[PDB]
């Protein structure tokens, strides 16, 4: 599996993030995170580097060349959907970075290193960066970097943007049904219904149903739906999920005629990941006194201040009679579930979330 490190990191990040946010909606792009963090890693040395490789799961299994090939595959023109991943480096115009770093970051990440005036015009630089990300995401991520995230001491901002727009292989019918948020709350949601031949299974270890909903082309959504807590009902699934347990099923399913009910939903979440990444073991990178980014600058005068991630998803019915029985499988997502969008060719997780609260 040529995207195993990324998936391992994704799951460990999700678990750590769930400590901070145990029940509310949660949405992120592990691919985007991993790409930016690999560019940061390329600059690290010493204990900073060793910790980053551990956290990003590079030691659990040519790193930069693997990112280059995976990105190429993710960016391949298809006709079936829109999918773009783009990296970018913004650097203080008066700073002198290591020539090998700028070269190799361009070579492996295609980051088109650009000078900006953080030293004197930080707020204009913030706006310029935000605007670039807005453009790459077709307006969907308009203000990645919040107020105060950049200042006169900022020297480099490393950025990834991802955008995906797909249509279901089979459209849904737009059908309100009660959604069970927790043992004390139900909220009405607009449901979408499909009856179709689909891959469906059950992961005993996680006590959850798994469904694959294909888009046109080689991208799918997988949904994981518990069938033991008075909260979201996800505690078991979230605590016990692992790469081995998930990958067996995404990459064991048999096709059947399934009646599917899922909510129409839209999420938009913003994270600041320093605390999470420190918790996962990436400590020295964020330590002003200890950080070693000599790969970026031989002066060894840099540290990682913060990591900002913003992700959104909008799920609806859009796709490219007489049946009356109900003997067979149902997948009725009227209570919280996990979901992920998988690039089937690379086996990379592009997006991963928890839908718990309409």
């Amino acid at each position: 599996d040529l995207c195993v490190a990324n998936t391992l990191f994704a799951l460990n990040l999700f678990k750590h993030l769930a400590k901070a946010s145990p029940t509310q909606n949660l949405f992120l792009s592990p691919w985007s995170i991993s790409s930016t963090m690999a560019m940061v890693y390329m600059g690290s040395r010493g204990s900073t580097e060793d910790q980053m490789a551990s956290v990003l799961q590079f030691n659990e299994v040519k790193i930069h060349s693997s990112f280059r090939s995976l990105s190429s595959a993710i960016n391949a023109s298809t006709g079936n959907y829109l999918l773009e991943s783009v990296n970018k480096l913004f650097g203080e115009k008066s700073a002198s970075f290591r020539e090998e770093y700028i070269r190799l970051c361009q070579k492996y990440y295609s980051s088109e290193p650009q000078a900006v005036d953080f030293l004197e015009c930080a707020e204009e630089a913030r706006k310029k960066i935000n605007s670039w990300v807005k453009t790459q995401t077709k307006g969907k991520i308009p203000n990645l970097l919040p107020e105060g995230s950049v200042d006169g001491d900022t020297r480099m901002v490393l950025v990834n943007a991802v955008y995906f727009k797909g249509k279901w292989k089979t459209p849904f019918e737009k059908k309100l049904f009660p959604f069970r948020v927790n043992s004390a709350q139900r909220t009405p949601v607009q449901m979408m219904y499909l009856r179709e031949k689909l891959n469906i299974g059950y992961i005993e270890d996680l006590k959850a149903q798994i469904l694959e909903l294909p888009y046109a082309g080689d991208v799918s959504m997988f949904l994981l739906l518990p069938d033991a807590d008075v909260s979201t009902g996800l505690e078991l699934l979230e605590s016990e999920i692992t790469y081995d347990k998930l990958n067996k099923w995404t990459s064991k399913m048999a096709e059947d005629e399934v009646e599917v009910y899922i909510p129409q939903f839209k999420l938009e979440e913003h994270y600041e990941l320093r605390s999470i990444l420190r918790s996962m073991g990436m400590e020295d990178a964020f330590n002003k006194g200890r950080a070693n980014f000599s790969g970026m600058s031989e002066r060894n005068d840099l540290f990682l201040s913060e990591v900002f991630h913003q992700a959104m998803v909008d799920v609806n019915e859009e796709g490219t009679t007489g049946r009356t029985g109900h003997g067979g499988p149902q997948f009725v997502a009227d209570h919280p579930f996990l979901f992920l969008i998988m690039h089937k060719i690379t086996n990379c997780i592009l997006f991963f979330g928890r839908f718990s609260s309409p």
């Binding site: 992120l28 991520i141 901002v157 990591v307 992700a311």
Partner: peptide, 14 residues
């Protein structure tokens, strides 16, 4: 499905 994301790491001088 429409989905998107951004990621920004900020390097700061010391």
């Amino acid at each position: 499905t429409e989905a998107a994301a951004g990621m920004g790491g900020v390097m700061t001088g010391r």
